[PDB]
Design a protein around this ligand. Sequence first.
Ligand SMILES: *O[C@H]1[C@@H](O)[C@H](n2cnc3c(N)ncnc32)O[C@@H]1COP(=O)(O)OP(=O)(O)OP(=O)(O)OC[C@H]1O[C@@H](n2c[n+](C)c3c(=O)[nH]c(N)nc32)[C@H](O)[C@@H]1O
Ligand SMILES: [Mg+2]
Ligand SMILES: [Mg+2]
Lengths: 731, 485, 726
Amino acid sequence: MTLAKIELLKQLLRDNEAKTVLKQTTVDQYNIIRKFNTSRIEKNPSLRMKWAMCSNFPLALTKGDMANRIPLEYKGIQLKTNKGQMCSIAAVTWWNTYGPIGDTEGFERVYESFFLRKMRLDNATWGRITFGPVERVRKRVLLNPLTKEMPPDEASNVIMEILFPKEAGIPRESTWIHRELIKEKREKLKGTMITPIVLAYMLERELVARRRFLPVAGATSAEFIEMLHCLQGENWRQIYHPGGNKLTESRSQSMIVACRKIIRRSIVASNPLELAVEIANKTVIDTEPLKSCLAAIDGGDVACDIIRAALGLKIRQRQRFGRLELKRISGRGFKNDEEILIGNGTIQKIGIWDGEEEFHVRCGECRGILKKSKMKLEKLLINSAKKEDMRDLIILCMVFSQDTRMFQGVRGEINFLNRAGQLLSPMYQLQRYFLNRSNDLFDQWGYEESPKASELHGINESMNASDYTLKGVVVTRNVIDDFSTEKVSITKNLSLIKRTGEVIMGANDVSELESQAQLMITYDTPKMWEMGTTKELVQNTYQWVLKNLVTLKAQFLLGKEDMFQWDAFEAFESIIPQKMAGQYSGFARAVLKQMRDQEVMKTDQFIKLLPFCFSPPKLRSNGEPYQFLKLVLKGGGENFIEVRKGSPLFSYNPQTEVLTICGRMMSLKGKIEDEERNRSMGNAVLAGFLVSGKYDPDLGDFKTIEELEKLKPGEKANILLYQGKPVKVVK
Amino acid sequence: AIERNLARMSPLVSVTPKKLTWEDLRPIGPHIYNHELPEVPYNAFLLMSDELGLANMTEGKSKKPKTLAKECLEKYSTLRDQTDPILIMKSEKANENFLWKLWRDCVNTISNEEMSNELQKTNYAKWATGDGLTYQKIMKEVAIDDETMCQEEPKIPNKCRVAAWVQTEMNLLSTLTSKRALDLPEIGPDVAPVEHVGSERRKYFVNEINYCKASTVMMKYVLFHTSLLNESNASMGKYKVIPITNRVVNEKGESFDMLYGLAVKGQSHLRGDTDVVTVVTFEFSSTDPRVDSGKWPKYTVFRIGSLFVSGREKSVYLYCRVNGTNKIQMKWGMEARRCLLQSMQQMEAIVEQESSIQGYDMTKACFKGDRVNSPKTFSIGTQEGKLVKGSFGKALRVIFTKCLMHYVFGNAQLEGFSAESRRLLLLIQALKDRKGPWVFDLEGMYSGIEECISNNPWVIQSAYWFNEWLGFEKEGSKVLESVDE
Amino acid sequence: GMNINPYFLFIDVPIQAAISTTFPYTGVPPYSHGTGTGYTIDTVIRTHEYSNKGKQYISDVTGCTMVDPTNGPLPEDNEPSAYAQLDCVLEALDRMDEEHPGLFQAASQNAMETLMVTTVDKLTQGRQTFDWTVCRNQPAATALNTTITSFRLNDLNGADKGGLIPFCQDIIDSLDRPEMTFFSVKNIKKKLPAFLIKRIPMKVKDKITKVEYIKRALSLNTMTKDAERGKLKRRAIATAGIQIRGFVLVVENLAKNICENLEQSGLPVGGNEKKAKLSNAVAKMLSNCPPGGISMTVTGDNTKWNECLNPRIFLAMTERITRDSPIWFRDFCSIAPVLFSNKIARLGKGFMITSKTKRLKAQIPCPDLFSIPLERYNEETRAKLKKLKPFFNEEGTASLSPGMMMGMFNMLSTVLGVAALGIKNIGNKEYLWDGLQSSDDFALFVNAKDEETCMEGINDFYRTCKLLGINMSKKKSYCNETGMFEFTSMFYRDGFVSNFAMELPSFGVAGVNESADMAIGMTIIKNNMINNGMGPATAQTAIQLFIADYRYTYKCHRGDSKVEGKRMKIIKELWENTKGRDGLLVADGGPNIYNLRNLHIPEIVLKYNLMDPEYKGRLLHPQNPFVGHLSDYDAVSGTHSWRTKRNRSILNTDQRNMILEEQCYAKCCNLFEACFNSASYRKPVGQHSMLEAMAHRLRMDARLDYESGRMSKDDFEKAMAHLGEI
RNA sequence: AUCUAUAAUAGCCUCUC
RNA sequence: GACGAGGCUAUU
RNA sequence: AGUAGUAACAAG
Ligand SMILES: *O[C@H]1[C@@H](O)[C@H](n2cnc3c(N)ncnc32)O[C@@H]1COP(=O)(O)OP(=O)(O)OP(=O)(O)OC[C@H]1O[C@@H](n2c[n+](C)c3c(=O)[nH]c(N)nc32)[C@H](O)[C@@H]1O
Ligand SMILES: [Mg+2]
Ligand SMILES: [Mg+2]
């Protein structure tokens, strides 16, 4: 209706106010005058709505034939005013009851995302509900699944292309990847009568992602975030199997997490291989057995290969670094924490892989062989492919090698922590930074004469073969057909050895990083809780101790060492770092033995220390146990047990005889002797030490752990059990 | 520079740390104990524990508030036809003759065959609603010239002492009755096991709350505020009789329409959110106002008849009071059901904790116990200076009553008291955990607490309860001071 | 008998675990009544009391009385003090710079880039803003438009360039004009018998002098705040004009950039992100405690935070932060603290004097406060006016050089607090302090060898804060052993506990419309289940309560119920006419089928397959008249997406002329949108006029229609003739 | 490995005596 | 007569 | 009167 618009503009230009507004207001200033409003917006819309619904005609009618279809009155109910026509809510009800019937094609199309949400809910299975501690971590996660996801700017450009191609402006190159998609969308909306802005927000709903910080526990995929409110609380878990289809990447990540957890649980057990097989055979990744998932997916990590070998499968030595697949050829690497100085000047803690390793590298179509050494990229033999893919593969290989030039090539701003202070994987951040600014990386790397061999030629930073090429990279004409195997036998300790006997993998190579699986992981075993986090394991172990408190105490008084061996304590041992497990065991065993033999028994301390007595004892060279003020456990700085005072994981109130474990309150009433209130805690805090009397000022200040450890037997010392309560002890 | 400036800064500039002890925590608001002050009077918008509802069997047909009131009054014709008043108590500035005339006009209008609840603007109605009481606005110049025009001295809320009726109301509102007032609508069927768990838990929780007197009082408040807002919007320039009504269900499933009294709405031209509409309330009761006259300074009470509940008949008095409300209060009264949530969410949390410790749903065990666990019990109150225990449901009802009172008696005094006393509660918790709390200006914190205890009955009773609980906590801590010592 | 004591719950449950019961948020929030002038005057008096021992002089630009407490004498007691020392602030900032190399430079560079790519329309994003042309409050967009038009009247066309920088240059230049011409609002009064006074506003030209314009630009409009919880007494808030708001943005952006990279700052992180950061920080401090020692946490609030902070210190902070920036950006960042150092407070509506015997009342405005003898004011007001007289301006305002009454430097005030937290030690003493800061709230973690050394460290931190103009509240602050504390009303007890009470007010009917309100309620329930520890039983009860509230609000009770009403008659008729009644919406009398598992599904989608075809067609009618239409495009939303005509009809005011200008703007914008369909979705860009853009677009459309056959010869000739005539 | 990227309006919550 | 900032939500 | 509470409404 171009002519109608021209006539409307001509008529509007007659008004002097309108003419001056049009002439003086810039296109930028339109955004100002669009919001012009002489009156303030009323506040408290809830009260305004409750008040207005009691009015007679609180609703505005759109003038037209359809408004005229509404009768003036209906059975003594006035629906519309007889300026701006207003109607009652009864008018809306009348329209819904007797109004014209319309075609609902638009609603079905505009809200397709919500219909997919409903279908995903409907084609879902519900498992059991379990009651128990659930440790949740706050992570930035995706709210709703999207088939294709792009950042908001790209999505806005694509939407402008689809819906408003004329007034779209510069053809940003970033839209290239999506050009085909645009055509497809322009196919579906060619003859739609829906208002364009609604279609634009439909497309945003389909393309733009919404990511929010939410508390999650073991299921971070958007299909699960949709049901998060029903998935779990703080004290219960609800097994859920969403409908639809799940990506292969999610399955691979979830199986990696499951295998790492299985290995961590199994290593501390006797015969770790048998326990690992037993757990793996009962592990389900969402709704599929772990063995089947390992058989299907072509990838994983060290833990996945170890679990494959334990199950009789074939190890796939594939690794993923974001954009490229790396298949091991030879060599074994070890990861070490080291403070590396980045080009920007800020020292960052990074895991550096030592040793010499060979990898079949694949990126898109480009293939190659990468020879890497500690902190140095030795060589990279590549085949001719797309120049763009070739350079992405080259930079990915250089960053993957952790070369000194790569680190020194950083010039700008790199964030290794998110706004919440959570640690982002440094190597992926470096990869992302160098992906879009490869110019500085190539400039820093250096160049050298291109090889003059018959089949070897170099490549320069100009993405073309030339007489100059960056150090290390060599092109070859020897076509390679990608990766398309080794045979190993898994030993008792979950170490993979070839026919020659050399260890190629082991349980000590498994990453210790605790991560949230994208897909819900289930263990169809009564001891599933043993695969939980540190806090869940601690709470479950202490609850088990409390449940069997009477029998445990009886066995302790009668028995000597058979009480220290239990499967619950075996699971507890997996969250103790292996370095301190023996020392903690020796300390706790000595403390409990002295509590028993000397007849000064404290139930709270006995319960606190019993789980730590599982590992084989590890005393000092002189035959005495190590002394500790707190026993540290894996993960977080708040995961520790205080020997003397209370701890975030364990505290005891003698007044109410209440034990607080990981925030849960339990009662020791009945399972307690009131005489234990008069009993001294100083007899249950140091191995080989017994309270000798009141705090003597002669001895001086309170001694420390190392000072206590060097005391001769039969020697006194002043000890501060906790604030406002000193005591003196003797050996 | 910082070191140099701190060197020359006076030692008087100090945070003055002081280690907190149980003996340093004194009772809050001692003035609530001195008998010089008057005991805090009853000021709630409606009777709660003294309410008396005339019950009429219904057929599930919510005809109309006017028809419901007319039928209820027809059932109790003796009360309806009582024409000669016997004054029992009189408010200081009330005209009992005008109030009785207004009550009779309300009864006649409700009982007439006409379908309208409008009242004429008569002399007694105009006095009761406060007609023509707004000051005339004059020009600035004349006012400045006029030397008699002065800024009014603000009226401050007065200071009152503890009144036993607040404790009585707390005791009676949290007791179980035989009537259900909650009208919770249906939800969708349960499919997921978590939904079935939620339904099973809702059974216990709602059955506990739905039968307590506080639920009926809350429903009366909600329904009356809804009706009042609708009438205020619909009838701005008319006096309307608004029956105070409820619908209850017996344990046998039979429903009753309950009429607790009648209200007269004055002119409602509420432009602002704080603008006041006057409401004159006439509420039936069985309580004799003379038993504790200090509770009813604001009420003009007539004795209008008698009723039979057992072999002993009970008197029926009419409590008449001029009151006011605004749109904010009417809106927040329509949504008082949220009290439920605040009571439920807390108690449910406790149950969940127990579940995590036992590995199975603990709702039934908490409420009534089971084979392996005894019912969970809470310190609920005092009886002759000794701590008394109560069931999980009793504690739930107490928390629900507390939230309902937060709504009923909530104002700025309650808000400030809650914040400052929360600070004090955190300090007390630190003491209980043996965390060795330290303070800097404890008297300042106490003064901040006590600045808010003037005339809010709930705040005064809360200060009394806080002092009692603090004494019990000191007694309990006396045993915790001799461990390994 | 037996007496119920609710506090006895705390005997069984720790305070933090039952903290929600200490928040009485089912009650009506306190509201303010009448004038806020008393609170504003109290604020002015206290702000000057905390700085009276500083340098007092007279401004040579405005003639106002100025108080400068910076570099003043050190305090000799524990009363609130605004005498911050520039040397100490600079030392703290240098320590921050040393501990975070390149942080100041990166933040300044990012802020400069954002400013260079920021347009003038960023200022429309505010709420009620002080308009100097009318000396009133107007919506931010309206105030910005009025300022732009007035500047156009005074040969100030920087806003045409589009960027915020040229417009701010225009503001700076406007401060130098010897005179100012603008458009203001004048009311005509008519006598309508009832007699009542009817007001008719209209636009009229006006002129003011340089000093008057400068004072208006530096003016703050003060009002009262309502619906505030947890406070016995009401307070006054303030709003600035366009001139100040233009420059506040860059300083806020710079401070935000700094704060995001400070591990000790609780801003701008909020919600679950803030909880994660705080938990991580607490765990780090717990693990960092030296062995055998003591760690003690101070829960603290700062008293008189805004009163005692000085804009001069903020100017110093800005100058220090932008050390390595170009001179233009340093000047730009210094503008806002300068404007705040010379700010003027408008004192509000005034007071009311009455005659009780004569039943009369009258409002004395601020310019006439001292026109009546002080004996005719009440005691408190008389004392406050006597104290205010020295700082009072004859036109009804007060000079307010000290303090931060606006409260627009939350991020910069957080940076200063964190800089205080970054000292960590005084005199090599045997303690170390760290902590978390969020404006005036802080948590201070002190590690030492015993309690006494921790107390010494706390005292040192208190005195150090005194040196920076920060006053730790000794009445509302306390300390205990690390493991339990409170920060920004979040209660940590071996972890952050859920506080369900603060979410209660959000569980009602939102007040947008029926469908949107249903969606909002269900989403609120779902998110409270996820975040605030709401169990499934409480969630289902919340569903039921929201359904009840919704039915009573929208008078859409169940179709098989017997409730009466205008809507209910038709609801019952629809219920009788309907076969698949489970498909009816709650607003149409249908049943509620929401449960926990489907809280995230919209109601129409949830019941879509259950609807009868006729009801579905009527409900989802593309051309239903209850929703707006673009002009006839199809609207996919149902008939329940209606809108209420929010006519702010102020009594006895007839806007026969303001509505005219609003309608003119609306017509121009509607025509422009008809010419440019993407304008609503994407902000149009261009320094050319709207008329030229529309003319060229219509010319192109006509020519392309002619070439494509859409338009014939005669229509093309008409269109070209009209375009040429235009 | 979500780091990036992110138009407008409105609502709720948090942050002087 | 109802401001600033942060988070979250809904809508176009 | 009353609501209420440091200032307002009790129509304009
Ligand atoms: O998201 C985490 C993890 O699940 C995911 N990941 C790792 N491997 C896969 C596969 N194969 N498929 C899908 N997703 C995968 O990436 C994150 C890994 O976290 P984390 O386990 O902590 O990493 P790791 O400790 O293994 O070291 P990192 O540098 O982050 O590299 C992880 C990945 O890259 C391999 N790798 C890199 N470099 C430089 C290596 C090397 O020099 N030598 C060896 N042997 N491996 C190297 C890691 O081994 C992993 O394969
Ligand atoms: Mg604080
Ligand atoms: Mg604070």
